[PDB]
Amino acid sequence: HMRKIIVGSRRSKLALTQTKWVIEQLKKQGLPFEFEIKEMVKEIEQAMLDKEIDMAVHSMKAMPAVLPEGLTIGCIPLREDHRDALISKNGERFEELPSGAVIGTSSLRRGAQLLSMRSDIEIKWIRGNIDTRLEKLKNEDYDAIILAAAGLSRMGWSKDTVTQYLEPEISVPAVGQGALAIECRENDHELLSLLQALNHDETARAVRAERVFLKEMEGGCQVPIAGYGRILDGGNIELTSLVASPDGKTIYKEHITGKDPIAIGSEAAERLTSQGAKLLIDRVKEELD
Known about the structure:
Structural class: alpha/beta
Order of helices and strands: EHEHEEEEHEHEHEEHHEEEHH
Largest sheet: 5 strands, mixed
CATH topology of the largest domain: D-Maltodextrin-Binding Protein, domain 2
Strand content: 15-25%
EC number: 2.5.1.61
Number of domains: 3
Strand order of the largest sheet: 2-1-3-10-4
Radius of gyration: 19 Å
CATH architecture of the largest domain: 3-Layer(aba) Sandwich
Number of helices: 9
GO biological process, one term: protoporphyrinogen IX biosynthetic process
Shape: globular
Pfam families: Porphobil_deam (PF01379), Porphobil_deamC (PF03900)
Helix content: 25-40%
CATH class of the largest domain: Alpha Beta
Family: Belongs to the HMBS family.
Enzyme class: transferase
């Protein structure tokens, strides 16, 4: 026999899609292993520590800033599109949307940055599938919605479903957007070896700097915080890190370029904290109660 690797997964169509793609990619190494999905965050992690599962595949922006002792991120594959995307009901770009246009998103990070660019538009909550939000755009009060360009690609959508791709200058992406995270036990050296070939350290070094900034600022999906990293020619990491207030009238923004990803994410957090961004994040976490 050969070892059968158990991969836990959230039951959504997107989650099982990512899980099967990682398995499909891990099979091309031709190494003696079996793979098996077991439909199931805290259950996942403890199940992995309990050894009832062996690994898990998440969206990097859905990974908690801090992993429990004993678990690690053993592989970050090649990064997909990292940008937010605007889809309008009537095909307008962001600057072309009429006054009072309603843009649908539940992300304070996305809403606060758009409000910083234009305060004459409204940001309203919206729920559901990529496929569900596209129908609500057609039938409801929304004039546009914001979606991750990586999510549209994984669900097999046209790049021309997007009206406009938001460059990081307009909307700094969430930490790890477009990237996958393969979580496993840090002492499973056999699994870590299989995951090495799928890893892509140009993506990994950039995301590591993003995650340190997220970690030092105590951030998450619910907090209006953003960070995008990329490798420049020469090995340097360029990290754009941002903290915004919900009404979009306060923008802490910092650009760092260096060689050590941990030191880069450290300085961005050290720098923005001194400007008063950590005080902001506490009030927003308090407001969420």
